[PDB]
Each structure stands twice: as C-alpha cells, then as structure tokens.
Amino acid sequence: YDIQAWKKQCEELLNLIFQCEDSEPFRQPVDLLEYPDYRDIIDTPMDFATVRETLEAGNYESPMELCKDVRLIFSNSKAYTPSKRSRIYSMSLRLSAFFEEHISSVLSDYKSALRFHKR
Numbered sequence: 001y002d003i004q005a006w007k008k009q010c011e012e013l014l015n016l017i018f019q020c021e022d023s024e025p026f027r028q029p030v031d032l033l034e035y036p037d038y039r040d041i042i043d044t045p046m047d048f049a050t051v052r053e054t055l056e057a058g059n060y061e062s063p064m065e066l067c068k069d070v071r072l073i074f075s076n077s078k079a080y081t082p083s084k085r086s087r088i089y090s091m092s093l094r095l096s097a098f099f100e101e102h103i104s105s106v107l108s109d110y111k112s113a114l115r116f117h118k119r
C-alpha cells in the first residue's frame, strides 16, 4: 500500500549493485580520456553514481524513472561494445539480470500501491 516505499528499496538495491564486482565499469561516468570516441557512439551517458545522486536529490518521482536510467547504462554498454564477447559487456549482462530480478517486485508493489491510492 505504501506509495513511497520504492525509494528505500531502490537505495538498498543500489547498495547491492555497488558491492557487486560486475558494477565496477559502471559506477562512475565513462572516462572520455579512456574512450575518446564515446560521445560519437553514445548520446546519453549514464552510470550508477548519477542514478544514486538523482535518487538522493529527490529527483525521481517513481521507480519507473530510475529503471529507465539503469536500463540506459546497459543499453549504452551494448551499443559501445565492439563484440558480444567483450569483458565489460559480459559484466553488463550479468548485472542487468541481477537488477531485473530485484526491481520486478519494486515496480509491481509501487504500481499496485498507486492503483490502490487512485481507486
């Protein structure tokens, strides 16, 4: 029933993602000195510290908005990878599976609570 519960649930999931070794390439914005052509390929950079900062600033209204930005971290990795076998892309796929497995109940509980609120 709690329409605000998603926020702490997302904070806890972000904490788990930061402890996961697979999140290392995605914890901070991609370094342009490391990947000089990054902005020629990626229009909208995204990373987990930016997601956490947006959440802590009170700049997400719903967990769907947070989801959209986390999914953008993974689609940017898929678009930038030179190979479906690359180390960083392979890390992104495992981390995406872990994220999707955990965000499912957050989204469901939020949408259910909002439907109850507007009944």
Ligand SMILES: CCNC(=O)c1c[nH]nn1
Pocket: 025, 026, 030, 035, 076, 077, 078, 080, 081, 082, 086, 087, 088, 089
């Ligand atoms: C963190 C920026 N690099 C990537 O997303 C990447 C590199 N190889 N495969 N994907």
